[PDB]
Design a protein around this ligand. Structure first.
Ligand SMILES: [Ca+2]
Ligand SMILES: [Ca+2]
Ligand SMILES: [Ca+2]
Ligand SMILES: [Fe+2]
Ligand SMILES: [Fe+2]
Ligand SMILES: [Fe+2]
Ligand SMILES: [Fe+2]
Lengths: 511, 387, 167, 511, 388
């Protein structure tokens, strides 16, 4: 018998579970309260070689479209200015999420004892590396072929100037790798990807296409195809510890803490990037958020984990109350601090203001009037000597940074949440924006010592910080960041220096 | 519908017009090179460097970092997400490393995918060609199944040794190389099982179960010192650099190379077995690929660090010494395998020449890089005593 | 029934071919067919729209009959008529090389095809002939290709000029 | 020394010329007046493995663009109707040229005696298989994702119904493989590709892009990347035979015949597909032709070969004289016979007639007026009972088919060439449209015996022919071909049957 | 400019608007399957079939053709562009053949490219690993350089034997399969040289020149009859099917398989040579791929033709006998090489058993398919006479 014969992935994976053997020190090297069953199985029966093949095939299509048809169509250029800027943040911020996920799944791979569960996490380790490079490619492509390379070309260092980056690291960097492996698994997979990341990636391709961007859909839709393996990983994480008695005592709290951590940042940030970083709208963020968080995640997803003792996050009701105006409240701060970014922002045009009011009754009387006031005052013109941060100072509206989530908040102006808790402990002041974050710090002060921008930049003149952190374009004079998206009247380092803006730690006013 | 309901800004007349109207006359910056601020290792910046270097958000307090401030969230106790405290080695910049092969995800899976599909084709031809007819039955049912198979647990163990490194690596370029080194190891282990699974299909009484090879690994005597050395490199080492260094620049470079290249790749051909060598060709290709990266990190970067050259070489000489013993021990327990070979398969003169090939390659490729003074004669002598 | 691919004419020849159950008779009919219906020297153009297809059907029968009647050596080296293929090939090439002009040459080549096309002569010899005969025919024909005026070329070819028109 | 080393294609190719060895019967199996030099060399130092890799890279980008981005953009649909129809003919007709080119180069590979020259042709053999499959893919893609699949989905059998197909087989099928290997090389490489195919492929991507088609550019631009090798093959053919006495005697004659052969079909057909098969125009055919045939080919390219005895085709002047109105004269015929195609045609619209009249003074007084009358006769309406062919009959304008080129012509109604030569020979009538083709037949009567559509369809009712050859849509009643490109009022087989059009062989009128 | 000067109908607002306006509300035909009229070999029509079948414009007078009428231009003399006259074999339809691997151009160059890049990686790993150190010098300098090298000309000759077929094949599916069978042969000849070139780089003194291997092929004794057979198959056969059939179902199936598998593949390992087997693995993979196509065309389609089955088998039986003798002669001369080996390398029993493996495989995969009555011991005994 000489019939052509071979062997596939499933046939090898069949005996993968037996690859691991017993010996005294065969245990995780990371602190954890849980015990992952040493017989846990994985959903996809893959071996290294088949994994590569299925991913290589996707790369083919993706890079083929990018290098050929899309380039021939000048797809990198024919994108709305506002969206070109938005993608600088979306792609780079997600990049770090993808990157730390490599470390996270590495930690999870070390945590799992069953060979198959380790193999499941391993596949994501590789996927996360692919995603890091994909998000990197989007910025690389828009830098090479876009209308404004600045920011796209150096976000890895220019992002350190702004406050939005700090919070991104909390949810997509540190939140993914610092803590109980299982807690990280919850931030990354059970909450992060299942509730936000996945729905977000697809949504982004929708807003991208609406604004002329066919580059992002080509890359992000490819990333999306890898998500079923990660959902399984997250789901299997729970199944792996469901039996352990410690689970009943700890799972729900790590989850709740994980849910709050992630929503605290994405609730305001995502809505902002979608509604304010685009010209053409796809759907109101309030509607989107409700579907994602309450219907899809909080309901169907969390529901299926019920048999494993998983319960709806106790802070869910709170998240919904704080959500409504969250993104609108944050854009005011983001724009007021525009010189600290690595992207260009625009104020809502007339059609947009109408869209905002139609979808968020009351929007115009608060946010709309403020933007028109700032614009008439010349916030878009470099010879005006006006930056919106000045307006906040003039009207005594201090801006704080939550010590835990790193999210900026202005309780005196906010149409949304306006709670503020300030504490002093061993010679250091702390500001919190909600009761959940306050507890985290109170219970785990050593986990949260992140210095905020006001602390680091205290006493420093704005232009010096920008210059030092390389917030300049090629000519070494024009700022990367801008308060408008037009091609003329770009602000320069000198236009900022003349403002004589000096940072102050707002918390010291309580002394 | 034929046109669909969704309107796209690139093709929709109305939307496209609005977009074109907002566009500037020319790019707002002529610098269209992402990663332009990265120091090129070669003539011009490569796609590999642009897409990888600085992806890791390290602050300046971690040699090379470009960010600032503490991490946002740390471990209960205060342990940082990534810190200098996770490895004895020090450097002026953790982002200096560069994979000689410049592998980011795409090139990496492209190459492994080509190998997978060609592997499949090879197997379909080998079986159709009846080449199994000329393979020594004992060599198959005994040395390939039991001893080669058992070696899959050695590679698998070395694979897992990279778990902590995947989590603790202090830079992107190093994390990627590490992840690829480990993934290649699990690949090899899965390839050893793949062969056994193939033999199971073309050889009526062959059993692919890992039971026999596993028992050999766990309770056997041939790989005893080997398994002990693996369990240690994997679960007793908490320094990600000591793990990678020792695994690749010591253990697998001595034991692993000898077993794959000097035992099976050298003897399989004598029993009419070109099947096993087909897979070892992959394992050796992978070994030589990883080696270039292992060398660039620990020697070109750390070992020759403009500020910690002496320091790092000391730590590595210490590690080399620390693991050279368990490895030599592993080689000795392995020598016992020759006694089970059919009479006349090989002689002491050959094995001695093979050991020196391994030891000499090791010295030239690793030991001499960190000024580690190893004695080829005493090592071979120490190992040869296992016969 | 007057179709392009199926018609009474083709049906009529299929029945005719079905009654050729002897190699000698089948082979003679095929050669006759070729003289009557192929090349610009065919005896008639009555089967112009179907001869190509009918010829193939005829060839099929001759081939099948030849394989049954001939031993292995003859199937390879003899024509369906029992002639030694090599001798026929060589003899024809010799005539071709003796041809005094392109007019004599075209008759030799065309006639060879009508009489020996494959089912008759083994393909190996027939295509070796195409190679040699074709070469000489072209050499003779392509020399000073445009020297003879159309007025005179029409006469050499022997066409009957029916109608001429020009600006 | 164990330095990583390998071997590349050039290193192996260095010894390829030595692969061939001497023996009595080592000679071409094909008749030829020429002798290809035993030591001829090739330009590109390739080997099988490297050839495969460079082509595989191209396929990757091509299919990636087609399957991903282009499909997501609905690129198969958003193309002008006229162009969707034009590509049915362009892609499938070129397909056969690509296909026969496989056999043609297999024939040249047999002809060449030097291993390197054989290898050069070999690479084209493989390229032509690629191009065949590529052209097939264009039709395959438009059938799968376009506005009108009929024709695209079965051209390989529906093209046999019409007269334009016959001429295509002469220049791109039989002309490529039947005759002296060198003659074939002239039709294929020295004339076909160099003068028409290459320029045509590029031009098609421009017209395609202008009409919304990004599918064809993706494939055809990829086809074009392989042409340098093919040009080298053509040039090398001439070099390999230049030092042979036979060359001075026969080369220019085979070249002139080849030139006339190719030009005779493409001069009128290309201009027709370009100008009449499109909405948006790129450039007038008159100027495109002069640049292609007279300047680029019959000047620059042709000159470079003067050193090998190559001269400008003696029929070049006649070609130009007949060229001007050629494509216009032909569209009148293709439209009049629209029921015999596998594509939908349209009358020039008001805006188009202006362009035509502007670029071709006198166009309106001739063709314009004619189309307006057919329009009035209801040529576009199914209930009119009118087909332009009837108009030709009523006005005694017989349409003849050139016995040699297969190109249809109406000498009584043509602004271009109006010559007609009718001969009787051994019981058969033959009609020629020019002095070059007439000479070809008189000298080589046995090479040109192709029966024309009137001869094959004589006495046949039109609807019966269309039905027998499968010229219908999937509903089994609506015709594939149409006299207009609109989506309603499509003609049915019954509409044609009612016309009771019965073919007559025009030449039978002569006594 | 950033936007460019050329306007595209897909993205230019004005032009796209014009295009969208002229579009129908829905496709003018719901049958969006190119090649729908092709009779599928498998469950559903394959992309391979759609893109390939009927590309060749044959008229109905060439079995299976869908066109009508004579060719537009023929050879001087009247020879048709393609015609029944170019082969002795007959069939109900020349388009019935299907490559079991369904290879059209794209999948074909993709797999070869994978093999090329991996080959390069392998060699870089082999050289860096210093595995050449344990290869027997005599085997390397004598048997690889001279005898394996001379075999490149055998494969090169078989490659060239396909030139006429590339021109005469009576259908697209057969032309594509034939082209690929031939292209794989030149690839193998080039891989033999590739190995010699590699050895010249990592082994001081090794000469990559083909002079020695070529002199062995053209004037040596070991390959004399092999070369005579190759020269015949290539240049004395004018029938494209006799060529493909005799090359793949007779000569290469017996002589080729014996040399590649029972001599070099079998003995190289005994001399610490894992390098040559790397390339032979490719050759054998190719051999087995082509076999499937060869079997489908000659046995499934022609040998089992509903109308010409008996006739075609008679002819292939004829060809088998014609070429079996020259093939036995080739194997017979090759037996002379065994005497050149270092004593103790192999013996008469191993050699005989290996001959039987090739003969038995041939009888099963080819001879039996057309009822060719092959006598295995008679064939083997005839070959053994060549043992010095
Ligand atoms: Ca008359
Ligand atoms: Ca014996
Ligand atoms: Ca017997
Ligand atoms: Fe990801
Ligand atoms: Fe994910
Ligand atoms: Fe082509
Ligand atoms: Fe070409």
């Amino acid at each position: 018998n000489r019939a052509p014969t071979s062997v596939n992935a499933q046939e090898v994976h069949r005996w993968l579970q037996s690859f691991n053997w017993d010996f005294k020190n065969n245990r995780t090297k990371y602190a954890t309260k849980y015990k992952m069953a040493n017989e846990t199985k994985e959903q996809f029966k893959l071996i290294a070689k088949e994994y590569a093949r299925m991913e290589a095939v996707k790369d083919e299509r993706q890079f083929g479209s990018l290098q050929d048809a899309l380039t021939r169509l000048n797809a990198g250029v024919r994108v709305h200015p506002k969206w070109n800027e938005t993608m600088k943040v979306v792609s780079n911020f997600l990049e770090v999420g993808e990157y730390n996920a490599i470390a996270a799944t590495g930690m999870l791979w070390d945590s799992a004892q069953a060979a198959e569960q380790k193999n499941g996490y391993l596949a994501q380790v590789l996927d996360e590396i692919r995603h890091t490079h994909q998000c990197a490619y989007v910025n690389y492509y828009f830098a090479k072929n876009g209308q404004d390379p600045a920011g796209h070309n150096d976000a890895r260092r220019t992002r350190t100037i702004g406050p939005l980056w700090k919070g991104m690291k909390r949810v997509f960097s540190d939140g993914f790798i610092s803590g109980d492996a299982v807690e990280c698994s919850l931030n990354l997979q059970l909450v992060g990807e299942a509730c936000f990341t996945n729905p977000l990636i697809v949504a982004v391709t929708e807003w991208a296409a609406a604004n002329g961007d066919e580059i992002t859909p080509t890359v992000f839709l490819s990333i999306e195809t890898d998500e079923l393996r990660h959902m399984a990983n997250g789901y299997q994480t729970v199944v792996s510890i469901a039996n352990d008695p410690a689970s009943a005592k700890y799972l729900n709290t790590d989850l709740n803490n994980a849910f709050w951590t992630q929503q605290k940042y994405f609730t305001p940030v995502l809505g902002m990037l979608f509604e304010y970083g685009s010209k053409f709208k796809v759907e109101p963020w309030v509607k989107t958020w409700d579907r994602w968080v309450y219907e899809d995640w909080g309901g169907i997803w969390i529901g299926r984990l019920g048999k494993y003792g998983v319960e709806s996050p106790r802070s869910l009701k709170d998240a919904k109350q704080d959500a409504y105006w969250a993104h609108h409240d944050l854009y005011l701060l983001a724009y007021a601090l525009w010189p600290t970014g690595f992207f260009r922002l625009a104020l809502p045009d007339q059609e947009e203001m109408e869209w905002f009011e139609a979808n968020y009754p009351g929007w115009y009387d608060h946010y709309g009037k403020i933007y028109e006031e700032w614009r008439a005052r010349g916030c878009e013109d470099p010879s005006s000597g006006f930056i919106p941060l000045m307006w906040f100072i003039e009207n005594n509206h201090p801006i704080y940074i939550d010590r835990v989530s790193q999210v900026p908040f202005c309780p005196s102006l906010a149409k949304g949440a306006s709670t503020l808790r300030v504490h002093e402990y061993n010679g250091e002041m702390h500001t919190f924006s909600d009761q959940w974050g306050e507890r985290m710090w109170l219970a785990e002060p050593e986990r949260y010592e992140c210095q905020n921008i006001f602390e680091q930049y205290e006493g420093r003149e704005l232009s010096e910080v920008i210059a030092e952190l390389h917030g300049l374009r090629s000519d070494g004079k024009t700022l990367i960041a801008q308060p408008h998206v037009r091609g003329d009247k770009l602000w320069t380092l000198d236009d900022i220096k003349r403002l004589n803006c000096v940072f102050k730690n707002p918390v010291k006013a309580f002394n | 519908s034929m046109l669909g309901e969704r309107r796209r800004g690139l093709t929709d007349p109305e939307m496209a017009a609005v977009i074109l109207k907002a566009l500037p006359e020319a790019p707002l910056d002529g610098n269209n090179k992402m990663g332009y601020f990265v120091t090129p290792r070669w003539k011009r910046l490569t796609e590999y460097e642009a897409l990888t270097v600085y992806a890791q958000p390290n602050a300046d307090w971690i040699a090379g970092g470009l960010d600032w401030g503490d991490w946002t969230q740390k471990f209960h106790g205060g342990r940082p997400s990534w810190g200098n405290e996770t490895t004895e080695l020090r450097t002026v910049d953790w982002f200096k490393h560069r994979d000689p092969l410049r592998r980011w995800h795409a090139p990496y899976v492209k190459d492994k995918a080509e190998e997978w599909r060609y592997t499949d084709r090879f197997l379909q031809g080998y079986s159709a060609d009846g080449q199994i007819r000329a393979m020594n039955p004992t060599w198959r049912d005994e040395f390939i199944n039991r001893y080669w198979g058992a070696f899959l647990f050695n590679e698998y163990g070395l694979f897992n040794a990279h778990s902590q490194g995947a989590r603790e690596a202090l830079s992107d370029v190093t994390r990627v190389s590490l992840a690829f080194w480990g993934f290649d190891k699990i690949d090899i282990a899965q390839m050893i099982q793949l062969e056994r699974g193939f033999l199971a299909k073309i050889v009526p009484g062959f059993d692919e179960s890992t039971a026999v090879p596993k028992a050999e690994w766990t309770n056997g005597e041939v790989y005893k010192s080997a398994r002990l050395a693996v369990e240690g490199l994997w679960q007793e080492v908490f320094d990600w650099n000591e793990s990678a260094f020792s695994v690749h620049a010591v253990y697998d470079a001595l034991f692993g190379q000898f077993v794959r290249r000097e035992f099976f790749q050298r003897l399989a051909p004598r029993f009419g077995d070109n099947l096993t060598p087909f897979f070892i060709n992959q394992a050796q290709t992978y070994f030589q690929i990883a080696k270039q990266g292992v060398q660039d990190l620990y020697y070109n970067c750390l070992g020759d660090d403009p500020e910690f050259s002496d320091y790092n070489r000391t730590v590595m000489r210490n590690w080399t010494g620390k693991w050279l013993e368990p490895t030599i021990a592993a080689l000795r327990d392995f020598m016992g395998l020759f006694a089970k070979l059919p009479a006349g398969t090989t002689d002491k003169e050959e094995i001695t020449a093979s050991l020196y090939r391994v030891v000499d390659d090791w010295i030239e490729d690793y030991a001499s890089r960190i000024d580690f003074k190893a004695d080829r004669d005493q090592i071979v002598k120490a190992v040869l005593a296992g016969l | 029934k007057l179709g392009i691919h199926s018609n009474d004419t083709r049906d009529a020849w299929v029945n005719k071919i079905a009654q050729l159950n002897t190699l000698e008779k089948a082979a003679e009919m095929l050669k006759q067919f070729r003289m009557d219906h192929t090349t610009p020297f065919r005896n008639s153009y009555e089967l112009d729209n179907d001869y190509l297809w009918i010829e193939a059907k005829l060839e099929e029968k001759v081939a099948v009959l030849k394989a049954r009647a001939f031993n292995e050596v003859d199937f390879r080296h003899k024509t369906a008529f029992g002639e030694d293929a090599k001798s026929v090939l060589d003899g024809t090439v010799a005539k071709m090389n003796a041809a005094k002009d392109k007019w004599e040459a075209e008759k030799i080549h065309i006639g060879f095809r009508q009489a020996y096309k494959p089912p008759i002569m083994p393909v190996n010899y027939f295509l070796d002939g195409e190679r040699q005969l074709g070469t000489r025919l072209m050499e003779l024909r392509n020399l000073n290709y445009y020297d003879t005026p159309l007025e005179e070329l029409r006469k050499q070819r022997g066409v009957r000029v029916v109608h001429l028109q020009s600006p």
